[PDB]
Amino acid sequence: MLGLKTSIIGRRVIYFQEITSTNEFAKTSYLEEGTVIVADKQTMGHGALNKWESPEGGLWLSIVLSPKVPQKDLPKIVFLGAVGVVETLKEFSIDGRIKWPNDVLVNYKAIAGVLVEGKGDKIVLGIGLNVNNKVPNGATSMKLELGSEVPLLSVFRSLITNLDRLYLNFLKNPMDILNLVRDNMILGVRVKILGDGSFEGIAEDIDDFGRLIIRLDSGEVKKVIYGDVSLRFL
Amino acid sequence: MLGLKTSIIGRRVIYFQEITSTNEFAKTSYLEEGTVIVADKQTMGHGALNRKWESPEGGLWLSIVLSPKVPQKDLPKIVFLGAVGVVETLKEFSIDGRIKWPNDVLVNYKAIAGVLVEGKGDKIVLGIGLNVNNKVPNGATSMKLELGSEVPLLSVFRSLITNLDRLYLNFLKNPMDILNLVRDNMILGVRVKILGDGSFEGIAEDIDDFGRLIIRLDSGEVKKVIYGDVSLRFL
């Protein structure tokens, strides 16, 4: 009854009033490619590192993918989610910018996060977007940005449509997404990579593998992988 | 993202752009009680007694997984939950739906919806097909045809699920209540023909405490019809 006209993403949609995590369900359940798992609320939502607040009002969903692309391209699925969110936000007159590698900010406030996990040769693309829900201190939502409630289903429709388009092109031209990320991410600013061997520098660009290129004050250039990176804006 | 607030029916909803049959998927798959299977269109829609049910885009084609822990004597009334739920939703949209015993809903004697219940003991599948904005077979009708304009399909879905959830929860508590709702919304007082092992005609007087259709033949003989392997035809 939803009348979705997408090719792959959204062929099937499993909706939950409540769920532990859409990502966990998508990983542990046999689902055909393109199946979307979405819930009004998550009781155990999570993302990069070890919680992702998922109260009623937001868009919490996961997409099952099994892309038949070269091994080295598989890691770029996270960018499809980030760019899809940016495109949807623009449709609603909101300017979102990507905080490499998986977050979307509006005026430097977090409005969405992407988490990609796997199970077998299935890839699960998880996306959390604050719409009308309460958000953690320092974060924002479409409602807070627009000053009014936003029809949640309309956001879902927009995002699924954008993701389907990005995914279909990714299957044929897997390098294209990097250009979209580059033109929509925060660059030219100082950042600090946390953890062992922590360092600071200017976030210059992302390379052909989606690695963040940082120029340290000494002139040294380091390439950061986005598997489970911890980054801070200075 | 649908924000359903129902207790059981609609806890989960599995939507399909296309499916063979929501009833078949529901019967076959491992699903929890209250899960709703809905599709934009069905390629193999089924009606009662092996009939074909046209399910083009524009209509509401869904099935609900139920596991009612009521006495076996009450299980046959589940089809009525579907019929009444549809009637209530139609009234919400100001359409006068009336029940054609025991599983059809008509508007001015034209079929607008059909209900098919399939069970095996514990797991019961309640299937409902309602014509909304889709083209229909000659002689049938739809919400769009009745109102003269397109009706938001999702609005009909929300309405029906809400009604079905309420009806089902009360059914578990008071299994007899549904019978009163069927009586008040069914076509009675007219001549009908009952088709099964042969056939007979008479006035459809009412439904009894078992949901059986009470028919008064011209001779004065009274027959009680149990649904399952029979069809009803208005004269």
Ligand SMILES: Nc1ncnc2c1ncn2[C@@H]1O[C@H](CO)[C@@H](O)[C@H]1O
């Ligand atoms: N619903 C949410 N919206 C935005 N950020 C969240 C949410 N839940 C947890 N966070 C975390 O708060 C951080 C914002 O500083 C993000 O990196 C994000 O992972």
Ligand SMILES: Nc1ncnc2c1ncn2[C@@H]1O[C@H](CO)[C@@H](O)[C@H]1O
């Ligand atoms: N979508 C539909 N709406 C109303 N009646 C239908 C529909 N599909 C099939 N039928 C009915 O099922 C019967 C054939 O088994 C016919 O009387 C036909 O009109």
Ligand SMILES: O=C(O)CCCC[C@@H]1SC[C@@H]2NC(=O)N[C@@H]21
């Ligand atoms: O910002 C991040 O670190 C990633 C957050 C990802 C959140 C979404 S909500 C839908 C899906 N289910 C989860 O448990 N996590 C992701």
Ligand SMILES: O=C(O)CCCC[C@@H]1SC[C@@H]2NC(=O)N[C@@H]21
């Ligand atoms: O009038 C009838 O004989 C019953 C028709 C039941 C139609 C619905 S459409 C949803 C569900 N899936 C099916 O294949 N049949 C039922």
